[PDB]
């Protein structure tokens, strides 16, 4: 499929940022879209081979794009504003001389523009063991994972049982909540459940891990604060079966 890099990016206002897109081999048309949260994609620029076909909606004071050899393309924002926080989607289509062909999308780049990179925190993760009352009443056992104190909302949570990721029996909140809702720098918390049979939990050989992938600052970001640099990283918590 179409490739895009990076998947997540944090930048400070007035800094610059570049996004990369590799279209489907041989696709003559390439599109860049901005998608604001709760909206649909809106075209930024479209290429036919290495030529700009539509750039009317490009915010030209700060946005620009190139596709110099008619294949891969770079979009850059210089300088970035807070309002540029969005998903940046790349797509390609064959570009044949007919009608509107099917557009094939990349996975997107999530851009978060912040006032202060010192507001970036990784999550702390805790796993809570099933209730004895639940085990007795339902013959089922629910584990809960809490990821807390992270900013910005750049997390992927997964569950691992005996070292293998599992999907059955799991539900993760689609949205985080704000730990301090009357604050626009507020850190976030997120919950997930994993439910197994009571006998599976009761087996002391079974291992349960909640994993949270956080996407934070990059290697090349400056950091002079005392606490650890809030880089992209995995934070996990674990629990063992009990009888």
């Amino acid at each position: 499929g179409v490739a895009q890099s990076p998947r997540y990016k944090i930048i400070e206002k007035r800094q610059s940022v570049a996004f990369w897109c590799n279209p489907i081999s041989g696709h003559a048309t390439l599109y860049w879209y901005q998608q604001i949260l709760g909206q649909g994609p809106k075209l930024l620029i479209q290429f036919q081979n290495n030529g700009v076909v539509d750039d009317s909606q490009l915010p030209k004071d700060r946005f620009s794009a190139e596709r110099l050899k008619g294949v891969d393309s770079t979009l850059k924002i210089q300088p970035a504003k807070l309002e540029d926080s969005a998903v940046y989607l790349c797509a390609s289509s064959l570009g044949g001389a007919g009608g509107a062909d099917t557009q094939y999308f990349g996975p997107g780049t999530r851009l978060t523009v912040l006032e202060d990179l010192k507001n970036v925190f990784p999550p702390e993760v805790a796993v809570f063991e099933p209730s004895e009352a639940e085990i007795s009443h339902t013959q089922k056992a629910t584990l809960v994972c809490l990821a807390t104190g992270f900013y910005p909302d750049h997390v992927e949570l997964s569950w691992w049982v005996n070292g293998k990721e599992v999907h059955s029996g799991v539900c993760t909140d689609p949205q985080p909540l704000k730990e301090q809702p009357a604050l626009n720098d507020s850190r976030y918390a997120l919950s997930s459940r994993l439910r197994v049979s009571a006998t599976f939990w009761q087996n002391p050989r079974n291992h349960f891990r909640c994993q949270v992938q956080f996407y934070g600052l990059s290697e090349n970001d400056e950091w002079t604060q005392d606490r650890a640099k809030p880089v992209t990283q995995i934070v996990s918590a674990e629990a063992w079966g009990r009888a």
Binding site: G1, V2, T29, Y31, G38, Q39, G40, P41, K42, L43, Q46, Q48, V53, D54, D55, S56, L89, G99, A100, T102, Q103, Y104, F105, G106, P107, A126, V127, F128, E129, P130, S131, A133, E134, H137, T138, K140, T142, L143, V144, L146, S168, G169, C171, T172, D173, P174, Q175, L177, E179, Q180, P181, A189, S191, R193, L194, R195, S197, A237, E238, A239
Partner: protein, 197 residues
């Protein structure tokens, strides 16, 4: 050239009909599409107006008298939960491009075979005396209201599928730092009178 999806959220019961509304404004003969994005997947084409084929059970009929292209399915499936985008193609707008509507999220609620609502207390696996309150096994009638107290956190309801067991259940989580916080009082929202504590 505009595409309007008038509602951002449609929540339906499993097996109930789905209609995701899309209206367009366009001078001439329009080309219309639906695109879909499932959780963690790429945005992708679902269907076009030119074929009558049902795709994943969905159809959409271009109705020029109503300038509509509504996406419809008679029996909602849990697998249909996703983001849906209507789109319209514009001829020689520099090239040939798409305009997207603003999206609608479809959420398909499970039909809980035997509601057994209860609030359980779970203790941290690390030696802290942190705990969480788990409200679970309630009917899809129940709505979970957000916390009004600043230092009590309550998540929305969430459905898990124990497909090995052919079993689905709703749950929501509540926790707090306070001395005062108890699961008997965690959810002072509209909960079932048969709720097990």
């Amino acid at each position: 050239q505009r595409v309007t999806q008038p509602e951002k959220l449609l929540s339906v019961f499993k097996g109930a009909p789905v209609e995701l509304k899309c209206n367009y404004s366009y001078s001439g003969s329009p080309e219309l599409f639906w695109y879909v994005q499932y959780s963690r997947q790429r945005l992708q084409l679902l269907l076009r107006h030119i074929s009558r084929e049902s795709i994943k059970g969905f159809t959409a009929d271009l109705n020029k008298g109503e300038t509509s292209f509504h996406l419809k399915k008679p029996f909602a499936q849990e697998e249909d939960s996703a983001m849906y985008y209507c789109a319209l193609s514009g001829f020689n707008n520099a090239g040939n491009m798409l305009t997207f509507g603003g999206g609608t999220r479809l959420m398909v609620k499970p039909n809980i075979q035997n509601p057994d609502p209860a609030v359980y207390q779970l203790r941290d696996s690390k030696s802290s005396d942190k705990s969480v309150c788990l409200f679970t096994d309630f009917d899809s009638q129940t709505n979970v209201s957000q916390s009004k107290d600043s230092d009590v956190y309550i998540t929305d309801k969430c459905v898990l599928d124990m497909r090995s067991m052919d079993f689905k259940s709703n749950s929501a989580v509540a926790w707090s730092n306070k001395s005062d916080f108890a699961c008997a009082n965690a959810f002072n929202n509209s909960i079932i009178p048969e709720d097990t504590f």
